[PDB]
């Protein structure tokens, strides 16, 4: 995101990785759903299952990787004057943990660009604004 904010047109496929960070004996299932750019994010499990999805059993597997298909951000809007796609997660089952372990588990996610990513038309990032003046600024001139 930070690097893409320095450019105007981006295109390519993203990859997303999720890591489960619960106990060794924690078990359960999750449904990861991807929706194409033209559509609405599902709200419930059965309408989520209609589209493309993957059932993740984090009892055995600890990390899951799903590849977002190739997408050109500029054509899809770019101040058409968003909704480029969603990734949602639903609980297929409950979370089963032993009594000795903690009853709350956590999930983290990573994102990266594939080798087909492209950037064009470098611009000025709006992330940090021009501070009127920093603390030591006249030292260079004196």
């Amino acid at each position: 995101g930070n690097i893409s904010r320095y450019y105007t047109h981006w295109s390519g496929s993203l990859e997303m990785t999720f890591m489960f960070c619960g106990s060794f004996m924690a078990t359960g299932k999750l449904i990861l759903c991807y929706t194409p750019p033209g559509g609405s994010c599902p709200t419930t499990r059965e309408t989520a299952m209609l589209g493309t999805h993957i059932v993740w059993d984090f009892g055995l597997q600890s990390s899951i990787t799903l590849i977002i298909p190739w997408i050109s951000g500029s054509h899809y809007r770019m101040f058409n004057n968003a909704n480029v796609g969603y990734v949602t997660c639903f609980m297929q089952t409950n979370l089963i943990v032993p009594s000795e372990s903690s009853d709350t588990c956590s999930l983290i996610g990573f994102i990266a660009a594939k080798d087909d990513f492209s950037l064009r038309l470098m611009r000025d990032s709006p992330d940090i604004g021009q501070i009127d003046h920093l603390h030591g600024a006249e030292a260079a001139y004196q």
């Binding site: 105007t8 770019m78 058409n80 038309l121 470098m122 000025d124």
Partner: protein
């Protein structure tokens, strides 16, 4: 047979903007958004002749060459003594789409390193730079049979693509004790022109720039 090629037919330098702006030190807050600088979005529908010549093909792909010729006239007031016309330097900045356009003569956007700028003097050969093909599609759409936004409010015939960008010209010099009138004349000449799907010519003189309405 070489005279009637599309490249020779369309690659003629034509005046596309002839705006002029005042320069004097406006102590009072008046004449906003045009105090000391001139802004123009790069289009081709401004002039009827060039618009009709271009509106013969559905798709075009070309590089625009910009020549900026500027003249200064003695401020039509105050002392008439012809002390001379000082060598004022000018800054012409090309702002591609998706970037920020300056709103005042002293905004920080004039110092951005992303936007390419040209500094030239009033007593030099006119400045010249060529803008490359800057569309996300493979060619410009002279005609667009569609709506821009995904909402129904989106305007008809306006393509979110194209929109080459904006051209901003200002006087770099801080206000002299005597003001002046600056006339900016900019010429555009397409280059490396490719054309597709020829169309019948246009009768029934134009009624607007945004659309193709007619008075029949």
């Amino acid at each position: 047979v070489s005279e009637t090629l599309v490249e020779n037919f369309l690659s003629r330098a034509a005046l596309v903007s002839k705006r002029s702006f005042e320069y004097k030190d406006h102590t009072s807050s008046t004449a906003q958004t045009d105090k000391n600088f001139f802004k123009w979005t790069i289009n081709t529908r401004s002039f009827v002749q060039l618009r009709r010549k271009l509106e013969l093909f559905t798709y075009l792909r070309f590089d625009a060459e910009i020549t900026i010729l500027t003249t200064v006239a003695v401020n039509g007031s105050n002392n008439n003594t012809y002390v001379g016309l000082p060598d004022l330097t000018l800054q012409a900045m090309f702002v591609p789409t998706g970037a920020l356009t300056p709103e005042k003569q002293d905004s920080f956007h004039w110092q951005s390193g992303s936007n390419a700028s040209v500094f030239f003097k009033i007593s030099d050969p006119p400045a010249r730079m060529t803008i490359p093909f800057m569309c996300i599609n493979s060619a410009y759409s002279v005609f667009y049979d569609g709506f821009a936004g995904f909402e129904k409010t989106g305007l008809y015939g306006i393509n979110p693509a194209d929109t080459i960008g904006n051209l901003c010209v200002r006087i770099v010099n801080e206000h002299q004790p005597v003001g002046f009138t600056v006339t900016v004349r900019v010429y555009m000449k397409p280059k490396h022109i490719k054309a597709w799907a020829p169309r019948p010519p246009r009768t029934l003189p134009y009624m607007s720039i945004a659309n193709a309405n007619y008075k029949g």
